Amino acid sequence: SFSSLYKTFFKRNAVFVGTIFAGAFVFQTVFDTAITSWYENHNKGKLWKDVKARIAA
Amino acid sequence: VTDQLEDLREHFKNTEEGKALVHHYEECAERVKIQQQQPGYADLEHKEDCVEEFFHLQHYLDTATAPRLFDKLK
C-alpha cells in the first residue's frame, strides 16, 4: 500500500527538520488544547467557569 | 437538622450498643474511680487509670466505621 507517493516523502533531509519541528509544535498545541478541554469537561460545578451563572439570578 | 456528625456518632454507637462490649470498661473505670479516687496525701502524681487506652480503642473502633454517610449537603 506504500505507493511511490509516500515513498518520495522519505528522502528529503535538509528541509525535513523544519517541517518536522513545525508538526511537533502543532501536535503539542492541539494536545494541550485537548487535555485542557478534557480536564474542563471531567469536572462541572467545582470549576470557576459556571459559578458565574450559579451566582447569577 | 443542625446535627450531622453527632447524629452519625449516635447511630454508630447505637449499632455498637447492639453488641455492647466496651462499656464493661466504663463500669470498671467507674469502680476504680469510686473506690480509688481519695488520696488525701499530696505526694501522689501517678493515679492509675483504666480510661486512656479504653477511650483510645473505643474512639478508634467506632470511628473506623465513621467515614461513611456522605450526606454533607452544600
Binding site: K46 | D49, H56, P67, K74
Partner: protein
C-alpha cells in the same frame, strides 16, 4: 513510643481534594473565605499570602476591591511627615488586628496563634488531621484527668490540652442557604480553604502533571520499542566453536 501522647492516627477520610484526577471544590472556597473571616478574624494572622491570588478562584472582580477600601493600611507620611490612613490595594497582604505580633500574646491568655498559612502541612496526616483535631474533642475530659484550670481537652491531638477556645458552636453562619449550622459543613469549608491557601496551585499542578505523565509514558513505551528493536541484531547472534587443527 507510648501511644498516650504519640497520638492515634485518624482514619483516612474521603474528600473532594484527595485523588489523582481531581480539582479543588472552589465553589465552596467562596464560602470558606466567609467562614474564616467571620470568626477567625481576631484570632489568627494568616498573613502570608496576597490578594492577587484571591481573584478568579474565590471572588470575581469587585468585592476584593470593596474589602481593600474597607480597611486602612498606614500610608506613607506626607510632605510634613505626619502619619495618615489610606485605603488598601489589590496587591497587599491579608492584615490582622495585632500590629505585628504584640496584641496576640497579650489577649490569648497563654501561647501564640500559629500562622494558618502553612498549618495544613505543618502537621502529620494532612487534610483530615485538622478535621479530626477540630471534631474529635469531647466537651468533657477523660475520667481521672484533671486539666489545668482554664484548659480544654483533645484526644486526637498529641498533647491532650490546648489554649484553643472551642468556638465551634453552630446556628450562626447562615450565608444564603440551609447548608450551614452543622459542624461538618464549616469544618470541610475551613479545611479546604486552608489547603488552598497552603497550596494555591492544585488545579494547575494536577493538569501539568497529567500532561507530563502522559508524555513521559508515551516516551517510555517508545524507548522500550526502539531498544528492543536495535538490540535485536545483538541479542540473537549465535556462536559456533570448531576446535582448531593441532599444530602451533
Amino acid at each position: 513510643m507510648t501511644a498516650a501522647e504519640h497520638g492515634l492516627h485518624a482514619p483516612a477520610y474521603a474528600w473532594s481534594h484527595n485523588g489523582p484526577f481531581e480539582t479543588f471544590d472552589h465553589a465552596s472556597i467562596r464560602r470558606g473565605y466567609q467562614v474564616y473571616r467571620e470568626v477567625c478574624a481576631a484570632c489568627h494572622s494568616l498573613d502570608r499570602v496576597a490578594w492577587r491570588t484571591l481573584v478568579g478562584v474565590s471572588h470575581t472582580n469587585e468585592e476584593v476591591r470593596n474589602m481593600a477600601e474597607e480597611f486602612e493600611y498606614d500610608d506613607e507620611p506626607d510632605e510634613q511627615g505626619n502619619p495618615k490612613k489610606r485605603p488598601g490595594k489589590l496587591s497587599d497582604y491579608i492584615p490582622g488586628p495585632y500590629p505585628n505580633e504584640q496584641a496576640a500574646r497579650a489577649a490569648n491568655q497563654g501561647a501564640l496563634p500559629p500562622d494558618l498559612s502553612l498549618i495544613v502541612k505543618a502537621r502529620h496526616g494532612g487534610c483530615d488531621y485538622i478535621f479530626s483535631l477540630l471534631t474529635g474533642y469531647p466537651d468533657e475530659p477523660p475520667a481521672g484527668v484533671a486539666l489545668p484550670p482554664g484548659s480544654n481537652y483533645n484526644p486526637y491531638f498529641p498533647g491532650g490540652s490546648i489554649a484553643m477556645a472551642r468556638v465551634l458552636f453552630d446556628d450562626m453562619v447562615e450565608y444564603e442557604d440551609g447548608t450551614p449550622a452543622t459542624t461538618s459543613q464549616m469544618a470541610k469549608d475551613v479545611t479546604t480553604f486552608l489547603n488552598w491557601c497552603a497550596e494555591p496551585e492544585h488545579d494547575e499542578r494536577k493538569r501539568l502533571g497529567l500532561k507530563t505523565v502522559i508524555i513521559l509514558s508515551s516516551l517510555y513505551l517508545l524507548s522500550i520499542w526502539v531498544k528492543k528493536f536495535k538490540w535485536a541484531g545483538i541479542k540473537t547472534r549465535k556462536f559456533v566453536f570448531n576446535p582448531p587443527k593441532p599444530r602451533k
